RNA sequence: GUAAUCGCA
DNA sequence: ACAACTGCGATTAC
DNA sequence: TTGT
C-alpha cells in the first residue's frame, strides 16, 4: 500500500539587501534602473496623479490603470500588432494593474540601521553572538559613543583595544592631520567605529568556530565549583552557562543554513506594495514618509562636505534609526511615539500580532460569497433532511443558476435580460428557481459553534416568508431556541462540495455526539410530554374506586386497530383500561411476580392472572390465548413504531 | 472559549493515518486499582481494543 | 467563494456555461499579502512543492 | 541520493507501520542512514540516533552488516562523535573488507581518511594504531589526505606529542623559501593563510567535517582526561552506592579516600581497587530491578515496590532492558 | 470547576495538580539515580513518572467533570495528556555533539538515543502545559504562530 | 476605511 | 515582555 | 486588574 507522497516545504529566512533590490530593480526598454523610492510624495497636488519617484510612483511600481499610462496613451498589452511593453515618454509599462498590489519597493539608507526584533528583544541574538553587553549595544546604536576595534580580519595600527568609548575625548584631530586626510578617512574604519558600521563589521569579521570553540572551553571551565557556591553565585553561574549553550546554538546553526548573521543589520529597507498600503491615508505610509524625509536629509548632509559638523549627521542618523525602529515594530523600546492626535503609532508587528492581526483576522478566518443569515423559526412538518427557505434569500443565493436556467430554457436571450426578469419577480423565475435546488444541499451554521454539529447540510424547501424555518429535532445539536437566534447559509458550487454534503454532512448520518456516543437528537420538551402523557397509565387503586371491588378492564378488542378505532370515536379514554388480544410474543416488559391469582377447572383448562395480562392454557400445556391489559396509548406507541419500520423496509423496495 | 480554543491547537496536528502502528504493550485496567466503581470501569473498557 | 480573484472571475463562467469547477491551484490573496508583508519585514516565505516523481523542486508564486 | 533526507524518511516510515511483508530490513535502515548521513542542509546527527534506536530489534533479523558500520562511522566522524566512532569501527573491524568499504571510492571526503584524522587530533593514538592494523590487514592504503599543517611537520604519525603547533629543532635551519618554491613557487598555486569573510575555513583538514575538525588534544592530556574520568565515575559510584564497600576499614579509610578522590580530580590502593564500576553490565541491572541486590491511583513511594507495580502491571520488564552492545552481539566490549 | 480543569491541563506547578505526585515525583528524582545505573535509571523514571503523571492528570480531570454530571469518554483526555507529558528536559550536565543542556526532544526519541548512544544522556521529564506545548511544535506557522 | 458607544443571542 | 469568547447589527465621529 |  504504497501511499501518495506530497512534499511541501515553506521556508522562512533573512534575506540580503541584493534579493531585497532584485524584488523591485528593474530595467526599462532605455536602460535606466527603477525600484528606488526617493521622494516622500505620495500624490500630486489638487491633482490626484502620482507623483514620480515617491511611494506611489508609476515607474517604479506599476501603472494605476489597466491598459492606460501616465504618458497619456493607452495600449492594448497582448495585441497582434507590436507594441512597445513601457512608454519611451513614461516608464509605466502597459499592465493591468494588479501589479500595484505585489511590487515592492526598496528605500537606500545612507546609515545602516538595526532590526528591532533581534536587538530590543529581551533575549537579544545580536547581544548572543557578540558577546558584548546588550546595554552597551544599546548605547552605541542610539547614544553617541564609540567601538574601538570593529575589525579582527584587518591590520590595526592604533592599540586602543576597548569595548565602549564613552567619549571622542581622546587625542584625533593631530591623528587626522598627521596622516593625509583621505588616509585618516581609508582607515578609520579599522579603527574606532560609531552607530552602526561597528556592529556590521563585527558581525560580518567573526568565525563561528572559534566562537563555538572559546563558548565549549568556557562552558568546560566554569561548573566546576559553582553549585557549592551562594544562590547568587549559583544563579549567576547557571545563566553564564544558558547563555554559553545559546550562544553555541546560534552559531552552530549559523554554519549550516545558508544565512548570514551580517544580513540582522538592514543595509537597504524594502518598501510595500502600494496597494496594500492605500491613501484614507495609513499610518505606515505616514511612517514610510518621516523615514525617507529623515534619510534624505541625512543624505544631503553627507554630501555637502566632509567638513559637516559629526553631531548633526549623528542626531539625523539616531532620527533615521528611531524612525525605522517604530516603522518596523514599535512598543518593544517602551516609547509610544504618538501622532499629532496623541494616538499610537501601529506597526508592522502591530499588523501581524493580535486577534485583530493578520493571522487570525485573515488567514484562518474570512467571509466568502453566495451568505445570507435570517432569523430561525420552528417548521414542525419538515423532515430531518429538509429545512425551510426564505425565497428572497434563495433568488440571491442560486442567483447564478437560475441564470443558467433561463439562458438554457427559451425565456431569456441573454444574461442582461435573464437579471431583469429576474429583478422583476417573474412567476416562471420561482419555478426555475424551485427545479434548480430539488438536489442542492444548503450548509446552515451558526455564531456559537462550540461542537462539530454547529454546522449541518439540508434540503432546502422553497418558503413564502423571511424565516428560515428548522426542524425541532435538530435544535439541541444547535443550541437553538427561536428567541432571536439567526443562522447563516452557505451553497457548495463544486461537484465534490456537493457530494460531501449530501453524503457527510447530514443530519440522519449524525446522530450521535462525539463525546460519549450518546442520542443527540430526542424528544426534548413538548414530544416528551405527549410521550409521558401516552404512556403514564391509568388509575388503578383508590383513585378509580371509591369502595373495595371484594363486594362485588371491561372491553374486550382482538386488533389495535379497533382499539385506537374506538378511541378516535371517543367510546374509550386515552387512559381507560381494556384488554388487548396478542398472538403468542410475550414481549411486555413486567416485573417477576407470580400469578396474583390461577382458575383451575376440572376439565384441564386453567387460567392464569398476572398483575398486567391473561394467559389462558389447556391440559396439553398449550397457550391458547393471550391477552394484555393496557391503554390505547401503549398499543399506539409501539404500533406507530412497528409501522414505521414496516413502512420504511415496504418503501425500500 | 478561550479553554476550547488552546486545546485544539495542542492536539490540532492528530490524524489517523495507519491501520496499525505494531506495539505490543498496553495499558492495564483494574477495578480495585481505584476503589472498583462498575460504571466507571465500563465505561473506561467500552470501545478500546 | 472568499479571496481567489481568478478563480472567483471563472466561478461564473463555469456556472453559466455549466463546466466543472477545477480546483484552485494557486494561493489566496491573503496569504500572497502576508509573504509581501513579512518580505517587507525582511522575512522570506516561499511554498517550494518537490515533486516524488523526478525529485525536483518548483517554486510556487 | 536525491539529497533530501525526508523522502526516503517518507518510505520508510511507510515500511516500518505496514504490514509484515512490507516491514523494513536491513537495506532499507542503511539506505535511510546514508541519506541522513549525507545531508547538506541541516544538523540531521539526532536523526540517525533515533533511527538508529528504532533499528535495535534483535529477533525480527534486523541485524548490521559492513554497510551499516561504515555508515555508522562516517556519520559520528562528520560530527565528531569519536566514542561512538570507535564503538562502531571495532565492529567493522570484524568483516572482511569492511575498510575498503568505509573507504567509498573517495567520492565522499574519504570518510574512513576522515576517521583517522579525527582520531589524531583529539589524541586517541592507541585506536589510531588499531585502525591502522586493520587497513594492513585489509590491504587499504592511506588516502591521499595526509594534509600537512602550517608548520610541515604535522602528519598523522606525530601531530599528538607534547609540543603542538610547533616544529621541532633540527640541525638544518628551515628554508622556508625551499619550502614556498616546493609548494609551487610562483606558480600561483600555494595556500595563503589569510582569513576571509565568508563561511569558508581557512584550514585543509575541516574539509569534509559538518562543523569542524575535532579540538586538538594531545595524547598525554587525553590520558590525564581519561584517568580523571575514570576516578571521578569511581568517587560518584562510592556516592551513590553508600558507605557499604568491599573495605572493612570505614572511617578513616573513607576520608582518605574521599581526600584522595578529590586531589585525584581536581598504600590503600587496595581499597579504592575494590570498588568496582559497573557500567554496561545488563544482567547487573537487572538483578537489580528484580530486588535480588487521596484514596486514588498511586504507585508506592519504595523503589522496589514501585519496581513490582510496574511488573504487575506490565509497564516494564527485564526483557525490555537491552542495548546495542546485546542486540548486534559484540562482545569485544 | 472550569478554573480548576485549565490548571491542570496548564500544569504551572506539579503541586498545585497533587502533592503526592510531586512528592513521588521528586523521590524517583532523587533515588532512581543510586539504584540500576546510568543507562536503566533515567529511562525507567521517565515511565514511571509519565504513567503516573497520566493516570493523575487523567483522574483528576475526570472526577472535575463528573463531580457536576458531565459524562465524557476517558480517550479524549488521553489524547491531549500524551501531549503534555510527551517530552523530556536534558539535564544541564550533559553536552554534546548530539544534543546540547536545556533542549526539549520526545520521550521514545530519547529512549532510542539512550539505548543506542553510550554518550550519557541526562534528561527528565517536564510536563509540558498546553501552552507551552503549542509553542514549541514542529510546524513554526501553525502553532507557533 | 478605521475608531467610540450601545444592542443582539 | 505576553494573553484574557464567538460573531452579528445599529449609530456618530474622523 | 490578574496572572504569567
Ligand atoms: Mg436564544
Same mark, same amino acid.
Given at each position: 500500500?504504497?501511499?501518495?507522497?506530497?512534499?511541501?516545504?515553506?521556508?522562512?529566512?533573512?534575506?540580503?539587501?541584493?534579493?531585497?533590490?532584485?524584488? !523591485?530593480?528593474?530595467?526599462?526598454?532605455?536602460?535606466?534602473?527603477?525600484?528606488?523610492?526617493?521622494?516622500?510624495?505620495?500624490?500630486?497636488?489638487?491633482?490626484?496623479?502620482?507623483?514620480?519617484?515617491?511611494?506611489?510612483?508609476?515607474?517604479?511600481?506599476?501603472?494605476?490603470?489597466?491598459?492606460?499610462?501616465?504618458?497619456?496613451?493607452?495600449?492594448?498589452?497582448?495585441?497582434?500588432?507590436?507594441?512597445?511593453?513601457?512608454?519611451?515618454?513614461c516608464?509605466?509599462?502597459?499592465?493591468?494593474?494588479?501589479?500595484?498590489?505585489?511590487?515592492?519597493?526598496?528605500?537606500?539608507?545612507?546609515?545602516?540601521?538595526?532590526?528591532?526584533?533581534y536587538?530590543?528583544?529581551?533575549?537579544?541574538?545580536?547581544?548572543?553572538?557578540?558577546?558584548?553587553?546588550?546595554?552597551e549595544?544599546?548605547?552605541?546604536?542610539?547614544?553617541?559613543f564609540?567601538?574601538?576595534?570593529?575589525?579582527?580580519?584587518?591590520?590595526?595600527?592604533?592599540?586602543?583595544?576597548?569595548?565602549?568609548?564613552?567619549?571622542?575625548?581622546?587625542?584625533?584631530?593631530?591623528?587626522?592631520?598627521?596622516?593625509?586626510?583621505?588616509?585618516?578617512?581609508?582607515?578609520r574604519?579599522?579603527?574606532?567605529?560609531?552607530?552602526?558600521?561597528?556592529?556590521?563589521?563585527?558581525?560580518?569579521?567573526?568565525?563561528?568556530?572559534?566562537?563555538?570553540?572559546?563558548?565549549?572551553? $568556557?562552558?568546560?571551565?566554569?561548573?566546576?565549583?559553582?553549585?557549592?557556591?551562594?544562590?547568587?553565585?549559583?544563579?549567576?553561574?547557571?545563566?553564564?552557562?544558558?547563555?554559553?549553550v545559546?550562544?553555541?546554538?546560534?552559531?552552530?546553526?549559523?554554519?549550516?543554513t545558508?544565512?548570514?548573521?551580517?544580513?540582522?543589520?538592514?543595509?537597504?529597507?524594502?518598501?510595500?506594495?502600494?496597494?496594500?498600503?492605500?491613501?484614507?491615508?495609513?499610518?505606515?505610509?505616514?511612517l514610510?514618509?518621516?523615514?525617507?524625509?529623515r534619510?534624505?536629509?541625512?543624505?544631503?548632509?553627507?554630501?555637502?562636505?566632509?567638513?559637516?559638523?559629526?553631531?548633526?549627521?549623528?542626531?539625523?542618523?539616531?532620527?533615521?534609526?528611531?524612525?525605522?525602529?517604530?516603522?518596523?515594530?514599535?512598543?518593544?523600546?517602551?516609547?509610544?511615539?504618538?501622532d499629532?492626535?496623541?494616538?499610537?503609532?501601529?506597526?508592522?508587528?502591530?499588523?501581524?500580532?493580535?486577534?485583530?492581526?493578520?493571522?487570525r483576522?485573515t488567514?484562518?478566518?474570512?467571509?466568502?460569497?453566495?451568505?445570507?443569515?435570517?432569523?430561525?423559526?420552528?417548521?414542525?412538518?419538515?423532515?430531518?433532511?429538509?429545512?425551510?427557505?426564505?425565497?428572497?434569500? !434563495?433568488?440571491?443565493?442560486?442567483?447564478?443558476?437560475?441564470?443558467?436556467?433561463?439562458?438554457?430554457?427559451?425565456?431569456?436571450?441573454?444574461?442582461?435580460? !435573464?437579471?431583469?426578469?429576474?429583478?422583476?419577480?417573474?412567476?416562471?423565475?420561482?419555478?426555475?428557481?424551485?427545479?434548480?435546488?430539488?438536489?442542492?444541499?444548503?450548509?446552515?451554521?451558526?455564531?456559537?459553534?462550540?461542537?462539530?454539529?454547529?454546522?449541518?447540510?439540508?434540503?432546502?424547501?422553497?418558503?413564502?416568508?423571511?424565516?428560515?424555518?428548522?426542524?425541532? &429535532?435538530?435544535c439541541?445539536?444547535?443550541?437553538?431556541?427561536?428567541?432571536?437566534?439567526?443562522?447563516?447559509?452557505?451553497?457548495?458550487?463544486?461537484?465534490?462540495?456537493?457530494?460531501? !454534503?449530501?453524503?457527510?454532512?447530514?443530519?440522519?448520518?449524525?446522530? &450521535?455526539?462525539?463525546?460519549?456516543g450518546?442520542?443527540?437528537?430526542?424528544?426534548?420538551?413538548?414530544?416528551?410530554?405527549?410521550?409521558?402523557?401516552?404512556?403514564?397509565?391509568?388509575?388503578?387503586?383508590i383513585?378509580?374506586?371509591?369502595?373495595?371491588?371484594?363486594?362485588?378492564? $371491561?372491553?374486550?378488542?382482538?386488533?389495535?386497530?379497533?382499539?385506537?378505532?374506538?378511541?378516535?370515536?371517543?367510546?374509550?379514554?386515552?387512559?381507560?383500561?381494556?384488554?388487548?388480544?396478542?398472538? &403468542?410474543?410475550?414481549?411486555?416488559?413486567?416485573?417477576?411476580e407470580?400469578?396474583?391469582?390461577?382458575?383451575?377447572?376440572?376439565?384441564?383448562?386453567?387460567?392464569?392472572?398476572?398483575?398486567?395480562?391473561?394467559?389462558?392454557?389447556?391440559?396439553?400445556?398449550?397457550?391458547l390465548?393471550?391477552?394484555?391489559?393496557?391503554?390505547?396509548?401503549?398499543?399506539?406507541?409501539?404500533?406507530?413504531?412497528?409501522?414505521?419500520?414496516?413502512?420504511?423496509?415496504?418503501?425500500?423496495? | 472559549?478561550?479553554?476550547?480554543?488552546?486545546?485544539?491547537?495542542?492536539?490540532?496536528?492528530?490524524?489517523?493515518?495507519?491501520?496499525?502502528?505494531?506495539?505490543?504493550?498496553?495499558?492495564?485496567?483494574?477495578?480495585?486499582?481505584?476503589?472498583?466503581?462498575?460504571?466507571?470501569?465500563?465505561?473506561?473498557?467500552?470501545?478500546?481494543? | 467563494?472568499?479571496?481567489?480573484?481568478?478563480?472567483?472571475?471563472?466561478?461564473?463562467?463555469?456556472?453559466?456555461?455549466?463546466?466543472?469547477?477545477?480546483?484552485?491551484?494557486?494561493?489566496?490573496?491573503?496569504?500572497?499579502?502576508?509573504?509581501?508583508?513579512?518580505?517587507?519585514?525582511?522575512?522570506?516565505?516561499?511554498?517550494?512543492?518537490?515533486?516524488?516523481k523526478?525529485?525536483?523542486?518548483?517554486?510556487k508564486? | 541520493?536525491?539529497?533530501?533526507?525526508?523522502?526516503?524518511?517518507?518510505?520508510?516510515?511507510?515500511m *516500518?507501520?505496514?504490514?509484515?511483508?512490507?516491514?523494513?530490513?536491513?537495506?532499507?535502515?542503511?539506505?535511510?542512514?546514508?541519506?541522513?548521513?549525507?545531508?547538506?542542509?541541516?544538523?540531521?546527527?539526532?536523526?540517525?540516533?533515533?533511527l538508529?534506536?528504532?533499528?535495535?530489534?534483535?529477533?525480527?533479523?534486523?541485524?548490521?552488516?559492513?554497510?551499516?558500520?561504515?555508515?555508522?562511522?562516517?556519520?559520528?566522524?562528520?560530527?565528531?562523535?569519536?566514542?561512538?566512532?570507535?564503538?562502531? #569501527?571495532?565492529?567493522?573491524?570484524?568483516?572482511?573488507?569492511?575498510?575498503?568499504?568505509?573507504?567509498?571510492?573517495?567520492?565522499?571526503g574519504?570518510?574512513?581518511?576522515?576517521?583517522?584524522?579525527?582520531?589524531?587530533? =583529539?589524541?586517541?593514538?592507541?585506536?589510531?594504531?588499531?585502525?591502522?592494523?586493520?587497513m594492513?590487514?585489509?590491504?587499504?592504503?592511506?588516502?591521499?589526505?595526509?594534509?600537512?599543517?602550517?608548520?610541515?611537520?604535522?602528519?598523522?604519525?606525530?601531530?599528538?606529542?607534547?609540543?603542538?603547533?610547533?616544529?621541532? *629543532?633540527l640541525?638544518?635551519?628551515?628554508?622556508?623559501?625551499?619550502?614556498?618554491?616546493?609548494?609551487?613557487?610562483?606558480?600561483?598555486?600555494?595556500?595563503?593563510?589569510?582569513?576571509?569573510?565568508?563561511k569558508?575555513?581557512?584550514?585543509?583538514?575541516? *574539509?569534509?567535517?559538518?562543523?569542524?575538525?575535532?579540538?586538538?588534544?594531545?595524547?598525554?592530556?587525553?590520558?590525564?582526561?581519561?584517568?580523571?574520568?575514570?576516578?571521578?565515575?569511581?568517587?560518584?559510584?562510592?556516592?551513590?552506592?553508600?558507605?557499604?564497600?568491599?573495605?572493612?576499614?570505614?572511617?578513616?579509610?573513607?576520608?582518605?579516600?574521599? *581526600?584522595?578522590?578529590?586531589?585525584?580530580?581536581? =598504600?590503600?590502593?587496595?581499597?579504592?581497587?575494590?570498588?568496582?564500576?559497573?557500567?554496561?553490565?545488563?544482567?547487573?541491572?537487572?538483578?537489580? #530491578?528484580?530486588?535480588?541486590?487521596?484514596?486514588?491511583?498511586? #504507585?508506592?513511594?519504595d523503589?522496589?515496590?514501585?519496581?513490582?507495580?510496574?511488573?504487575?502491571?506490565?509497564i516494564?520488564?527485564?526483557?525490555?532492558?537491552?542495548?546495542?552492545?546485546?542486540?548486534?552481539?559484540?562482545?569485544?566490549? | 470547576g472550569?478554573?480548576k480543569?485549565?490548571?491542570?491541563?496548564e500544569?504551572?506547578?506539579?503541586?498545585?495538580?497533587?502533592?503526592?505526585?510531586?512528592?513521588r515525583?521528586?523521590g524517583?528524582?532523587?533515588?532512581?539515580?543510586?539504584?540500576?545505573?546510568?543507562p536503566?535509571?533515567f529511562?525507567?523514571?521517565?515511565?514511571?513518572?509519565?504513567?503516573?503523571?497520566?493516570?493523575?492528570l487523567?483522574?483528576?480531570?475526570?472526577?472535575?467533570?463528573?463531580?457536576?454530571?458531565?459524562?465524557?469518554?476517558?480517550?479524549?483526555?488521553?489524547?491531549?495528556?500524551?501531549?503534555?507529558?510527551?517530552?523530556?528536559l536534558?539535564?544541564?550536565?550533559?553536552?554534546?555533539?548530539?544534543?546540547?543542556?536545556?533542549?526539549?526532544?520526545?520521550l521514545?526519541?530519547?529512549?532510542?538515543?539512550?539505548?543506542?548512544?553510550?554518550?550519557?544522556?541526562?534528561?527528565?521529564?517536564?510536563?509540558?502545559?498546553?501552552?507551552?506545548?503549542?509553542?514549541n511544535?514542529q510546524?513554526?506557522?501553525?502553532?507557533?504562530?
Amino acid at each position: 500500500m504504497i501511499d501518495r507522497y506530497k512534499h511541501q516545504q515553506l521556508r522562512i529566512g533573512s534575506v540580503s539587501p541584493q534579493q531585497i533590490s532584485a524584488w !523591485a530593480t528593474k530595467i526599462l526598454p532605455n536602460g535606466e534602473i527603477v525600484g528606488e523610492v526617493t521622494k516622500p510624495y505620495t500624490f500630486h497636488y489638487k491633482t490626484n496623479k502620482p507623483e514620480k519617484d515617491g511611494l506611489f510612483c508609476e515607474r517604479i511600481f506599476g501603472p494605476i490603470k489597466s491598459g492606460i499610462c501616465a504618458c497619456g496613451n493607452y495600449r492594448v498589452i497582448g495585441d497582434e500588432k507590436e507594441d512597445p511593453k513601457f512608454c519611451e515618454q513614461c516608464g509605466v509599462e502597459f499592465v493591468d494593474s494588479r501589479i500595484r498590489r505585489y511590487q515592492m519597493g526598496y528605500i537606500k539608507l545612507a546609515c545602516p540601521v538595526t532590526h528591532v526584533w533581534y536587538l530590543k528583544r529581551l533575549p537579544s541574538y545580536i547581544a548572543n553572538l557578540l558577546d558584548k553587553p546588550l546595554k552597551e549595544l544599546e548605547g552605541l546604536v542610539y547614544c553617541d559613543f564609540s567601538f574601538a576595534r570593529p575589525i579582527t580580519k584587518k591590520p590595526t595600527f592604533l592599540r586602543l583595544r576597548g569595548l565602549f568609548e564613552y567619549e571622542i575625548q581622546s587625542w584625533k584631530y593631530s591623528i587626522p592631520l598627521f596622516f593625509t586626510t583621505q588616509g585618516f578617512d581609508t582607515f578609520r574604519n579599522r579603527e574606532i567605529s560609531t552607530g552602526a558600521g561597528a556592529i556590521r563589521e563585527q558581525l560580518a569579521d567573526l568565525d563561528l568556530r572559534i566562537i563555538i570553540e572559546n563558548s565549549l572551553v $568556557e562552558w568546560e571551565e566554569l561548573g566546576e565549583e559553582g553549585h557549592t557556591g551562594n544562590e547568587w553565585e549559583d544563579r549567576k553561574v547557571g545563566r553564564r552557562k544558558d547563555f554559553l549553550v545559546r550562544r553555541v546554538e546560534l552559531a552552530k546553526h549559523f554554519i549550516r543554513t545558508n544565512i548570514e548573521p551580517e544580513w540582522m543589520v538592514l543595509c537597504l529597507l524594502p518598501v510595500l506594495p502600494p496597494e496594500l498600503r492605500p491613501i484614507m491615508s495609513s499610518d505606515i505610509n505616514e511612517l514610510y514618509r518621516r523615514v525617507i524625509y529623515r534619510n534624505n536629509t541625512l543624505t544631503d548632509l553627507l554630501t555637502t562636505s566632509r567638513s559637516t559638523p559629526g553631531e548633526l549627521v549623528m542626531c539625523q542618523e539616531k532620527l533615521v534609526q528611531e524612525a525605522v525602529d517604530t516603522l518596523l515594530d514599535n512598543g518593544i523600546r517602551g516609547q509610544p511615539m504618538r501622532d499629532g492626535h496623541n494616538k499610537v503609532y501601529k506597526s508592522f508587528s502591530d499588523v501581524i500580532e493580535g486577534k485583530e492581526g493578520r493571522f487570525r483576522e485573515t488567514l484562518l478566518g474570512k467571509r466568502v460569497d453566495y451568505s445570507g443569515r435570517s432569523v430561525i423559526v420552528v417548521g414542525p412538518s419538515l423532515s430531518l433532511h429538509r429545512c425551510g427557505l426564505p425565497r428572497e434569500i !434563495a433568488i440571491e443565493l442560486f442567483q447564478t443558476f437560475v441564470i443558467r436556467g433561463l439562458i438554457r430554457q427559451h425565456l431569456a436571450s441573454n444574461i442582461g435580460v !435573464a437579471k431583469s426578469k429576474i429583478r422583476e419577480k417573474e412567476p416562471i423565475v420561482w419555478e426555475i428557481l424551485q427545479e434548480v435546488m430539488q438536489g442542492h444541499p444548503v450548509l446552515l451554521n451558526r455564531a456559537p459553534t462550540l461542537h462539530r454539529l454547529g454546522i449541518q447540510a439540508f434540503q432546502p424547501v422553497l418558503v413564502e416568508g423571511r424565516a428560515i424555518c428548522l426542524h425541532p &429535532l435538530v435544535c439541541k445539536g444547535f443550541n437553538a431556541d427561536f428567541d432571536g437566534d439567526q443562522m447563516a447559509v452557505h451553497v457548495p458550487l463544486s461537484l465534490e462540495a456537493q457530494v460531501e !454534503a449530501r453524503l457527510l454532512m447530514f443530519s440522519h448520518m449524525n446522530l &450521535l455526539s462525539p463525546a460519549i456516543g450518546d442520542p443527540i437528537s430526542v424528544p426534548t420538551q413538548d414530544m416528551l410530554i405527549g410521550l409521558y402523557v401516552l404512556t403514564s397509565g391509568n388509575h388503578r387503586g383508590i383513585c378509580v374506586n371509591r369502595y373495595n371491588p371484594c363486594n362485588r378492564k $371491561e372491553p374486550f378488542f382482538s386488533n389495535s386497530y379497533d382499539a385506537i378505532g374506538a378511541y378516535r370515536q371517543k367510546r374509550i379514554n386515552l387512559d381507560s383500561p381494556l384488554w388487548l388480544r396478542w398472538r &403468542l410474543d410475550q414481549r411486555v416488559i413486567a416485573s417477576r411476580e407470580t400469578p396474583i391469582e390461577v382458575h383451575y377447572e376440572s376439565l384441564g383448562t386453567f387460567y392464569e392472572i398476572y398483575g398486567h395480562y391473561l394467559i389462558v392454557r389447556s391440559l396439553k400445556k398449550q397457550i391458547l390465548f393471550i391477552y394484555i391489559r393496557t391503554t390505547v396509548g401503549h398499543i399506539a406507541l409501539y404500533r406507530e413504531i412497528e409501522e414505521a419500520i414496516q413502512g420504511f423496509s415496504r418503501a425500500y423496495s | 472559549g478561550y479553554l476550547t480554543r488552546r486545546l485544539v491547537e495542542v492536539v490540532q496536528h492528530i490524524v489517523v493515518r495507519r491501520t496499525d502502528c505494531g506495539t505490543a504493550r498496553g495499558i492495564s485496567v483494574s477495578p480495585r486499582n481505584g476503589m472498583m466503581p462498575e460504571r466507571i470501569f465500563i465505561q473506561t473498557l467500552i470501545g478500546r481494543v | 467563494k472568499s479571496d481567489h480573484i481568478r478563480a472567483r472571475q471563472e466561478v461564473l463562467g463555469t456556472t453559466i456555461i455549466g463546466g466543472t469547477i477545477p480546483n484552485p491551484e494557486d494561493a489566496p490573496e491573503s496569504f500572497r499579502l502576508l509573504v509581501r508583508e513579512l518580505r517587507s519585514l525582511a522575512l522570506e516565505l516561499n511554498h517550494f512543492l518537490v515533486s516524488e516523481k523526478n525529485f525536483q523542486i518548483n517554486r510556487k508564486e | 541520493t536525491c539529497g533530501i533526507p525526508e523522502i526516503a524518511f517518507a518510505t520508510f516510515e511507510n515500511m *516500518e507501520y505496514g504490514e509484515d511483508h512490507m516491514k523494513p530490513d536491513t537495506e532499507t535502515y542503511n539506505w535511510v542512514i546514508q541519506a541522513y548521513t549525507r545531508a547538506e542542509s541541516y544538523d540531521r546527527v539526532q536523526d540517525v540516533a533515533e533511527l538508529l534506536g528504532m533499528m535495535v530489534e534483535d529477533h525480527k533479523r534486523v541485524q548490521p552488516n559492513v554497510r551499516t558500520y561504515a555508515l555508522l562511522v562516517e556519520c559520528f566522524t562528520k560530527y565528531c562523535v569519536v566514542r561512538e566512532a570507535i564503538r562502531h #569501527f571495532r565492529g567493522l573491524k570484524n568483516f572482511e573488507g569492511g575498510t575498503q568499504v568505509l573507504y567509498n571510492d573517495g567520492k565522499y571526503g574519504d570518510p574512513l581518511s576522515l576517521y583517522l584524522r579525527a582520531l589524531c587530533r =583529539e589524541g586517541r593514538i592507541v585506536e589510531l594504531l588499531e585502525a591502522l592494523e586493520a587497513m594492513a590487514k585489509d590491504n587499504q592504503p592511506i588516502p591521499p589526505r595526509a594534509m600537512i599543517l602550517s608548520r610541515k611537520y604535522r602528519t598523522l604519525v606525530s601531530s599528538w606529542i607534547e609540543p603542538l603547533q610547533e616544529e621541532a *629543532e633540527l640541525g638544518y635551519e628551515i628554508d622556508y623559501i625551499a619550502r614556498y618554491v616546493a609548494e609551487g613557487g610562483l606558480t600561483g598555486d600555494r595556500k595563503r593563510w589569510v582569513p576571509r569573510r565568508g563561511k569558508t575555513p581557512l584550514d585543509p583538514d575541516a *574539509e569534509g567535517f559538518i562543523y569542524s575538525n575535532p579540538r586538538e588534544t594531545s595524547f598525554k592530556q587525553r590520558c590525564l582526561e581519561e584517568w580523571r574520568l575514570h576516578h571521578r565515575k569511581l568517587l560518584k559510584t562510592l556516592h551513590n552506592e553508600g558507605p557499604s564497600i568491599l573495605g572493612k576499614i570505614s572511617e578513616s579509610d573513607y576520608i582518605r579516600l574521599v *581526600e584522595r578522590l578529590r586531589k585525584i580530580i581536581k =598504600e590503600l590502593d587496595e581499597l579504592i581497587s575494590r570498588i568496582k564500576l559497573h557500567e554496561g553490565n545488563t544482567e547487573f541491572w537487572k538483578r537489580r #530491578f528484580l530486588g535480588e541486590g487521596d484514596d486514588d491511583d498511586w #504507585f508506592p513511594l519504595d523503589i522496589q515496590e514501585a519496581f513490582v507495580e510496574m511488573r504487575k502491571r506490565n509497564i516494564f520488564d527485564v526483557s525490555d532492558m537491552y542495548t546495542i552492545t546485546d542486540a548486534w552481539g559484540w562482545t569485544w566490549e | 470547576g472550569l478554573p480548576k480543569v485549565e490548571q491542570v491541563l496548564e500544569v504551572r506547578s506539579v503541586d498545585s495538580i497533587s502533592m503526592n505526585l510531586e512528592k513521588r515525583i521528586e523521590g524517583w528524582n532523587k533515588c532512581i539515580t543510586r539504584i540500576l545505573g546510568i543507562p536503566w535509571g533515567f529511562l525507567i523514571g521517565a515511565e514511571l513518572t509519565i504513567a503516573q503523571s497520566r493516570i493523575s492528570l487523567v483522574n483528576k480531570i475526570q472526577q472535575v467533570y463528573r463531580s457536576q454530571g458531565v459524562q465524557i469518554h476517558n480517550r479524549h483526555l488521553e489524547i491531549i495528556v500524551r501531549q503534555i507529558t510527551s517530552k523530556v528536559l536534558v539535564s544541564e550536565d550533559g553536552m554534546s555533539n548530539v544534543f546540547s543542556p536545556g533542549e526539549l526532544i520526545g520521550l521514545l526519541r530519547a529512549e532510542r538515543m539512550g539505548r543506542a548512544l553510550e554518550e550519557a544522556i541526562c534528561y527528565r521529564v517536564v510536563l509540558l502545559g498546553i501552552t507551552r506545548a503549542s509553542l514549541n511544535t514542529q510546524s513554526f506557522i501553525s502553532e507557533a504562530s
